[PDB]
Amino acid sequence: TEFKAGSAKKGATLFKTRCLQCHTVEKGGPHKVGPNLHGIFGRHSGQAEGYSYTDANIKKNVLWDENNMSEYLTNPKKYIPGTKMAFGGLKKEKDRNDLITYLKKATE
């Protein structure tokens, strides 16, 4: 995938409707079904303090960046088979760019 900076404003709404059910973004925010995502970019997968991940998410050991995040969010279980993230994917490229643009800001 080839991430292109988009609209964090539209990304924020996508996060609310598609991700917030299972994730927080703020520093020190609580885990839910999924891990809090603060600091995700530039850290390896499966490392949020205090959260119990699948073996798949840990052993994937990917250094998250905007491009591999775009691939992941297209189809999570294809990128990380054995994941327990029950999310089908954002099939639209502009949605992925906008969501990732938001996520970069929100998880800083």
Ligand X SMILES: O=S(=O)(O)c1cc2c(O)c(c1)Cc1cc(S(=O)(=O)O)cc(c1O)Cc1cc(S(=O)(=O)O)cc(c1O)Cc1cc(S(=O)(=O)O)cc(c1O)C2
- Binding site, residues? 19, 22-23, 85
Please report whether residue 6 would count as binding ligand X according to CB under 6 A: yes
Strand partners, 44: 63
Number of residues that bind ligand X (CB under 6 A): 10
Q: Which of residues 38-97 bind ligand X (CB under 6 A)?
A: 92-95, 97
Residue 48 vs 103, nearer CB to ligand X: 103
- The interface with ligand HEM within residues 35-94 (CB under 6 A) comprises 35, 37, 40, 45-48, 53-54, 56-57, 73, 83-87, 90
Question: Could you say which of ligand X, ligand HEM, none residue 92 binds, taking C-beta under 5 to 8 angstroms by partner kind?
Answer: ligand X
Give CA–CA dist 90/10, Å, rounded: 14
Short-list 101, 104, 108, CA closest to 9: 101
Helix pair 66-74, 93-106: axis angle to 10 deg: 130
DSSP state of 44: B
